Amino acid sequence: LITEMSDYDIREMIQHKHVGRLGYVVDDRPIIVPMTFRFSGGSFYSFTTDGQKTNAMRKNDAICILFDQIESQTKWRTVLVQGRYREIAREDEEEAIVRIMANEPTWWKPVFFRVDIEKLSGHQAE
Amino acid sequence: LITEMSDYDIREMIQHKHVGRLGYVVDDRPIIVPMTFRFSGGSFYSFTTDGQKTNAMRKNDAICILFDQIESQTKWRTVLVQGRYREIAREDEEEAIVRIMANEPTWWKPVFFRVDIEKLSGHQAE
Numbered sequence: 001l002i003t004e005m006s007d008y009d010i011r012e013m014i015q016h017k018h019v020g021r022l023g024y025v026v027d028d029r030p031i032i033v034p035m036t037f038r039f040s041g042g043s044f045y046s047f048t049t050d051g052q053k054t055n056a057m058r059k060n061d062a063i064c065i066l067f068d069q070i071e072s073q074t075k076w077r078t079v080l081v082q083g084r085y086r087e088i089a090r091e092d093e094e095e096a097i098v099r100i101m102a103n104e105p106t107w108w109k110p111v112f113f114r115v116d117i118e119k120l121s122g123h124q125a126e
Numbered sequence: 127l128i129t130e131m132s133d134y135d136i137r138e139m140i141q142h143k144h145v146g147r148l149g150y151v152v153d154d155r156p157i158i159v160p161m162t163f164r165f166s167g168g169s170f171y172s173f174t175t176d177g178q179k180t181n182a183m184r185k186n187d188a189i190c191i192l193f194d195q196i197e198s199q200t201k202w203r204t205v206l207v208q209g210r211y212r213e214i215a216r217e218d219e220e221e222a223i224v225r226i227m228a229n230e231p232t233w234w235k236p237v238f239f240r241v242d243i244e245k246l247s248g249h250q251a252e
Protein backbone atom coordinates (compact mmCIF):
# COMPACT_ATOMS: atom_id res chain seq x y z
CA LEU A 1 0.00 0.00 0.00
CA ILE A 2 1.36 3.36 -1.23
CA THR A 3 -0.09 6.51 0.43
CA GLU A 4 0.73 10.22 0.48
CA MET A 5 3.11 11.29 3.23
CA SER A 6 1.88 13.88 5.72
CA ASP A 7 3.40 17.37 5.42
CA TYR A 8 5.05 16.80 8.81
CA ASP A 9 6.87 13.65 7.57
CA ILE A 10 7.80 15.32 4.30
CA ARG A 11 9.19 18.23 6.34
CA GLU A 12 11.12 15.94 8.72
CA MET A 13 12.70 14.25 5.66
CA ILE A 14 13.76 17.44 3.83
CA GLN A 15 14.99 19.20 6.96
CA HIS A 16 16.95 16.12 8.23
CA LYS A 17 18.01 14.07 5.16
CA HIS A 18 21.31 15.70 4.15
CA VAL A 19 21.99 13.45 1.10
CA GLY A 20 19.65 13.73 -1.86
CA ARG A 21 20.02 12.46 -5.42
CA LEU A 22 20.07 15.23 -7.98
CA GLY A 23 18.70 14.70 -11.48
CA TYR A 24 19.48 16.83 -14.49
CA VAL A 25 19.23 16.55 -18.23
CA VAL A 26 22.05 16.57 -20.81
CA ASP A 27 21.21 16.18 -24.50
CA ASP A 28 17.79 14.78 -23.60
CA ARG A 29 19.32 12.06 -21.31
CA PRO A 30 18.90 12.00 -17.49
CA ILE A 31 21.90 11.95 -15.07
CA ILE A 32 21.69 11.33 -11.36
CA VAL A 33 24.31 12.32 -8.80
CA PRO A 34 24.20 12.19 -4.98
CA MET A 35 24.69 15.61 -3.32
CA THR A 36 24.24 17.03 0.10
CA PHE A 37 21.57 19.71 0.41
CA ARG A 38 20.31 22.23 2.95
CA PHE A 39 16.67 23.23 2.85
CA SER A 40 16.46 26.91 3.82
CA GLY A 41 13.79 29.58 3.04
CA GLY A 42 11.91 27.21 0.77
CA SER A 43 14.84 26.29 -1.49
CA PHE A 44 17.53 23.67 -1.38
CA TYR A 45 21.10 24.91 -1.27
CA SER A 46 24.17 23.09 -2.37
CA PHE A 47 27.41 23.47 -4.34
CA THR A 48 29.60 21.62 -6.81
CA THR A 49 33.22 21.85 -7.92
CA ASP A 50 32.29 19.82 -11.03
CA GLY A 51 32.21 22.28 -13.98
CA GLN A 52 30.40 19.66 -16.11
CA LYS A 53 27.45 19.60 -13.72
CA THR A 54 27.42 23.38 -13.53
CA ASN A 55 27.49 23.68 -17.32
CA ALA A 56 24.83 21.06 -17.81
CA MET A 57 22.44 22.80 -15.43
CA ARG A 58 23.08 26.24 -16.92
CA LYS A 59 21.96 24.91 -20.32
CA ASN A 60 18.97 23.00 -18.88
CA ASP A 61 17.84 24.26 -15.50
CA ALA A 62 15.01 21.74 -15.12
CA ILE A 63 16.16 19.53 -12.21
CA CYS A 64 14.87 17.34 -9.42
CA ILE A 65 15.99 15.92 -6.13
CA LEU A 66 14.99 12.60 -4.63
CA PHE A 67 15.11 12.10 -0.85
CA ASP A 68 14.25 8.66 0.38
CA GLN A 69 14.27 6.39 3.32
CA ILE A 70 14.06 2.79 2.19
CA GLU A 71 13.75 0.15 4.95
CA SER A 72 12.59 -2.66 2.68
CA GLN A 73 10.90 -3.46 -0.65
CA THR A 74 7.55 -2.65 1.04
CA LYS A 75 8.59 -0.13 3.76
CA TRP A 76 9.83 3.16 2.35
CA ARG A 77 9.38 6.92 2.08
CA THR A 78 10.21 9.06 -0.96
CA VAL A 79 10.13 12.84 -1.42
CA LEU A 80 10.64 14.27 -4.92
CA VAL A 81 11.45 17.92 -5.44
CA GLN A 82 11.02 19.22 -8.99
CA GLY A 83 12.38 22.64 -9.70
CA ARG A 84 14.97 24.88 -11.24
CA TYR A 85 18.70 25.35 -10.96
CA ARG A 86 19.44 28.85 -9.80
CA GLU A 87 23.17 29.55 -9.61
CA ILE A 88 24.44 31.70 -6.80
CA ALA A 89 26.34 34.88 -7.80
CA ARG A 90 29.80 35.54 -6.28
CA GLU A 91 28.29 38.43 -4.28
CA ASP A 92 25.76 36.06 -2.74
CA GLU A 93 28.12 33.14 -1.84
CA GLU A 94 28.60 34.19 1.80
CA GLU A 95 24.80 34.23 2.19
CA ALA A 96 24.59 30.83 0.61
CA ILE A 97 27.34 29.45 2.87
CA VAL A 98 25.64 30.74 6.09
CA ARG A 99 22.23 29.35 4.94
CA ILE A 100 23.86 26.04 4.26
CA MET A 101 25.64 25.85 7.63
CA ALA A 102 23.63 27.90 10.13
CA ASN A 103 22.13 25.75 12.90
CA GLU A 104 22.54 22.40 11.11
CA PRO A 105 22.28 19.38 13.59
CA THR A 106 25.08 17.29 11.92
CA TRP A 107 28.82 17.91 11.21
CA TRP A 108 30.44 19.00 7.90
CA LYS A 109 36.45 26.64 -6.44
CA PRO A 110 32.87 25.62 -5.68
CA VAL A 111 29.96 27.02 -7.57
CA PHE A 112 26.99 27.41 -5.20
CA PHE A 113 23.46 26.90 -6.32
CA ARG A 114 19.97 26.58 -5.10
CA VAL A 115 17.01 24.55 -6.23
CA ASP A 116 13.76 26.48 -6.27
CA ILE A 117 10.73 24.29 -5.83
CA GLU A 118 8.04 23.97 -8.44
CA LYS A 119 6.53 20.68 -7.21
CA LEU A 120 7.07 18.78 -4.01
CA SER A 121 5.60 15.34 -3.53
CA GLY A 122 5.99 12.66 -0.96
CA HIS A 123 4.74 9.11 -0.63
CA GLN A 124 5.24 6.12 1.59
CA ALA A 125 4.60 2.38 1.62
CA GLU A 126 3.82 0.25 4.65
CA LEU B 127 40.08 12.40 -3.78
CA ILE B 128 37.75 10.99 -6.47
CA THR B 129 39.10 8.05 -8.54
CA GLU B 130 37.67 5.55 -11.03
CA MET B 131 36.35 2.34 -9.49
CA SER B 132 37.92 -0.93 -10.62
CA ASP B 133 35.78 -3.15 -12.85
CA TYR B 134 35.67 -5.69 -10.02
CA ASP B 135 34.15 -3.13 -7.58
CA ILE B 136 31.75 -1.86 -10.22
CA ARG B 137 30.72 -5.48 -10.83
CA GLU B 138 30.30 -6.23 -7.10
CA MET B 139 28.03 -3.15 -6.83
CA ILE B 140 25.77 -3.94 -9.81
CA GLN B 141 25.51 -7.64 -9.04
CA HIS B 142 24.80 -7.07 -5.29
CA LYS B 143 23.07 -3.66 -4.94
CA HIS B 144 19.38 -4.53 -5.46
CA VAL B 145 18.04 -0.94 -5.10
CA GLY B 146 18.98 1.57 -7.75
CA ARG B 147 17.54 5.01 -8.52
CA LEU B 148 16.00 5.22 -11.95
CA GLY B 149 16.01 8.47 -13.92
CA TYR B 150 13.76 9.30 -16.83
CA VAL B 151 12.62 12.37 -18.68
CA VAL B 152 9.08 13.78 -18.98
CA ASP B 153 8.52 16.99 -20.94
CA ASP B 154 12.22 17.82 -20.70
CA ARG B 155 12.22 17.48 -16.84
CA PRO B 156 14.06 14.69 -14.95
CA ILE B 157 12.26 12.31 -12.50
CA ILE B 158 13.98 9.91 -10.16
CA VAL B 159 12.40 6.85 -8.57
CA PRO B 160 13.97 4.05 -6.50
CA MET B 161 13.51 0.57 -8.04
CA THR B 162 14.94 -2.83 -7.49
CA PHE B 163 16.97 -4.22 -10.38
CA ARG B 164 18.60 -7.48 -11.43
CA PHE B 165 21.67 -7.33 -13.64
CA SER B 166 21.54 -10.32 -16.01
CA GLY B 167 23.15 -10.88 -19.45
CA GLY B 168 24.44 -7.32 -19.57
CA SER B 169 21.11 -5.59 -18.95
CA PHE B 170 19.21 -4.55 -15.87
CA TYR B 171 15.77 -6.08 -15.40
CA SER B 172 12.92 -4.70 -13.43
CA PHE B 173 9.17 -4.04 -13.53
CA THR B 174 6.60 -1.43 -12.59
CA THR B 175 2.86 -1.42 -11.97
CA ASP B 176 2.90 2.38 -12.42
CA GLY B 177 1.39 3.13 -15.88
CA GLN B 178 2.72 6.71 -15.69
CA LYS B 179 6.31 5.48 -15.50
CA THR B 180 5.70 3.00 -18.29
CA ASN B 181 4.13 5.68 -20.49
CA ALA B 182 6.86 8.19 -19.76
CA MET B 183 9.59 5.75 -20.73
CA ARG B 184 7.80 4.63 -23.90
CA LYS B 185 7.77 8.25 -25.10
CA ASN B 186 11.39 8.91 -24.03
CA ASP B 187 13.46 5.77 -23.63
CA ALA B 188 16.64 7.57 -22.58
CA ILE B 189 17.12 6.52 -18.94
CA CYS B 190 19.77 5.99 -16.29
CA ILE B 191 20.26 4.16 -13.05
CA LEU B 192 22.36 5.27 -10.12
CA PHE B 193 23.78 2.68 -7.70
CA ASP B 194 25.69 4.04 -4.76
CA GLN B 195 27.21 3.20 -1.48
CA ILE B 196 27.65 6.34 0.58
CA GLU B 197 29.47 5.94 3.93
CA SER B 198 30.20 9.63 4.43
CA GLN B 199 30.62 12.98 2.65
CA THR B 200 34.14 11.82 1.65
CA LYS B 201 33.76 7.99 1.56
CA TRP B 202 31.47 6.79 -1.22
CA ARG B 203 31.06 4.75 -4.39
CA THR B 204 28.76 5.57 -7.31
CA VAL B 205 27.94 3.59 -10.45
CA LEU B 206 25.88 5.27 -13.19
CA VAL B 207 24.26 3.25 -15.93
CA GLN B 208 23.06 5.23 -18.95
CA GLY B 209 20.90 3.39 -21.42
CA ARG B 210 17.56 2.68 -22.95
CA TYR B 211 14.20 1.47 -21.75
CA ARG B 212 13.30 -1.72 -23.51
CA GLU B 213 9.86 -3.00 -22.53
CA ILE B 214 9.37 -6.72 -22.21
CA ALA B 215 6.67 -8.29 -24.44
CA ARG B 216 3.98 -10.51 -22.83
CA GLU B 217 5.57 -13.54 -24.55
CA ASP B 218 8.89 -12.76 -22.89
CA GLU B 219 7.64 -12.08 -19.30
CA GLU B 220 8.39 -15.60 -18.01
CA GLU B 221 11.97 -15.20 -19.27
CA ALA B 222 12.21 -11.85 -17.59
CA ILE B 223 10.84 -13.23 -14.31
CA VAL B 224 13.35 -16.16 -14.25
CA ARG B 225 16.27 -13.78 -15.08
CA ILE B 226 15.16 -11.52 -12.31
CA MET B 227 14.87 -14.30 -9.71
CA ALA B 228 17.24 -17.09 -10.71
CA ASN B 229 20.06 -17.58 -8.20
CA GLU B 230 19.65 -14.22 -6.43
CA PRO B 231 21.39 -14.19 -2.92
CA THR B 232 18.61 -12.14 -1.15
CA TRP B 233 14.84 -12.69 -0.58
CA TRP B 234 11.91 -11.16 -2.54
CA LYS B 235 -0.42 -6.12 -13.62
CA PRO B 236 3.31 -5.39 -13.80
CA VAL B 237 4.97 -4.27 -16.97
CA PHE B 238 8.48 -5.76 -17.13
CA PHE B 239 11.35 -3.92 -18.68
CA ARG B 240 15.04 -3.99 -19.12
CA VAL B 241 17.67 -1.31 -19.29
CA ASP B 242 20.24 -1.86 -22.01
CA ILE B 243 23.56 -0.26 -21.27
CA GLU B 244 25.07 2.43 -23.42
CA LYS B 245 27.52 3.82 -20.83
CA LEU B 246 28.61 2.46 -17.50
CA SER B 247 30.77 4.51 -15.19
CA GLY B 248 31.89 4.14 -11.65
CA HIS B 249 33.83 6.33 -9.25
CA GLN B 250 34.78 6.40 -5.61
CA ALA B 251 36.08 8.82 -3.00
CA GLU B 252 38.33 7.98 -0.08
Ligand SMILES: [Cl-]
Nearest residue numbers: 035036046047
Ligand atom coordinates in the same frame (compact mmCIF):
# COMPACT_ATOMS: atom_id res chain seq x y z
CL1 LIG C 1 27.58 18.10 -2.35
Ligand SMILES: [Cl-]
Nearest residue numbers: 088092095096
Ligand atom coordinates in the same frame (compact mmCIF):
# COMPACT_ATOMS: atom_id res chain seq x y z
CL1 LIG D 1 20.60 32.99 -2.49
Ligand SMILES: [Cl-]
Nearest residue numbers: 161162172173
Ligand atom coordinates in the same frame (compact mmCIF):
# COMPACT_ATOMS: atom_id res chain seq x y z
CL1 LIG E 1 10.79 -2.26 -8.33
Ligand SMILES: [Cl-]
Nearest residue numbers: 214218221222
Ligand atom coordinates in the same frame (compact mmCIF):
# COMPACT_ATOMS: atom_id res chain seq x y z
CL1 LIG F 1 14.24 -10.08 -22.38
